[PDB]
């Protein structure tokens, strides 16, 4: 017995002898398609953004227990926006909270820090929104859903009611020992389940800000069109 090799021939003919139902209020909206196929280059954390949600356990003290006679309309969006802000904001100025959430630090020395915060430069737009002068509106993306033409920003609730948001935030970090309430993953380690600069690339700044000053007047070549309508 052997295995065949190259060069050989071919002789064909000559004579040898459970469809789920409650999905309708989850996935809404339509989505167009273009004759050019999609090209995309962004991350999925920027497609979600505010990386915390608060469950049924603590919305029931915020939605129907705060709003008895609360003068400011304290809605559930900033109940998720502002709470997720200092979930972040405590951790970049204290990265060692894990072994002791009995070391839950106080706002009375956090009180200038998170007010001037720029959360991994979260407000990267408003200084450049100066150049497009779209402060009549705000900045809207396709990376932003249809529920943010009515939202309200951060600082003018922290001294108002944001003194009473980190209060309930603390006590369920000690039962989970200093992590997110639906905890992060098995992230601790991949363990168990359960002179060349000098000559050519010295113009790499110049390579791409040719488009950045291009970007606003090609955003103004349509911002001559949404003031055309007014």
């Amino acid at each position: 017995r052997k295995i065949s090799v190259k060069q050989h021939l071919k002789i064909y003919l000559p004579n040898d002898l459970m469809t789920w139902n409650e999905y309708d209020k989850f996935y809404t909206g339509s989505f167009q398609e273009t004759t050019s196929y999609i090209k995309f280059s962004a991350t999925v954390e920027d497609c979600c953004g505010t990386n915390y949600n608060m469950d049924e356990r603590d919305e029931t003290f915020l939605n129907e227990q705060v709003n008895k006679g609360s003068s400011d309309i304290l809605t559930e969006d900033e109940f998720e926006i502002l709470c997720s802000s200092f979930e972040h904001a405590i951790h970049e100025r204290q990265p060692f909270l894990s072994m002791d959430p009995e070391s839950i630090l106080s706002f009375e020395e956090l009180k200038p820090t998170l007010i001037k915060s720029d959360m991994a430069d979260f407000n990267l737009r408003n200084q450049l929104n100066h150049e497009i002068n779209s402060h009549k509106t705000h900045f809207i993306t396709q990376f932003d859903p249809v529920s943010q033409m009515n939202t309200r920003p951060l600082i003018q609730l922290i001294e108002k009611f944001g003194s009473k948001i980190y209060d309930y935030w603390r006590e369920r970090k000690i039962e989970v020992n200093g992590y997110e309430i639906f905890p992060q993953l098995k992230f601790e380690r991949p363990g168990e389940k359960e002179i060349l600069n000098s000559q050519r690339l010295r113009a790499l700044h110049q390579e791409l800000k040719n488009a950045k000053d291009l970007a606003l007047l090609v955003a103004k070549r349509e911002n001559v069109s949404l003031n055309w309508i007014n």
Binding site: N210, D213, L217, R221, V224
Partner: peptide
């Protein structure tokens, strides 16, 4: 007054598009 900004920027595209994107 909605269009007196439309009548000067449109050449800054071509003055820039023939600056780097047309060598």
């Amino acid at each position: 007054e909605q269009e007196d900004t439309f009548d000067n920027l449109q050449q800054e595209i071509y003055d820039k598009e023939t600056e780097y994107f047309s060598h």
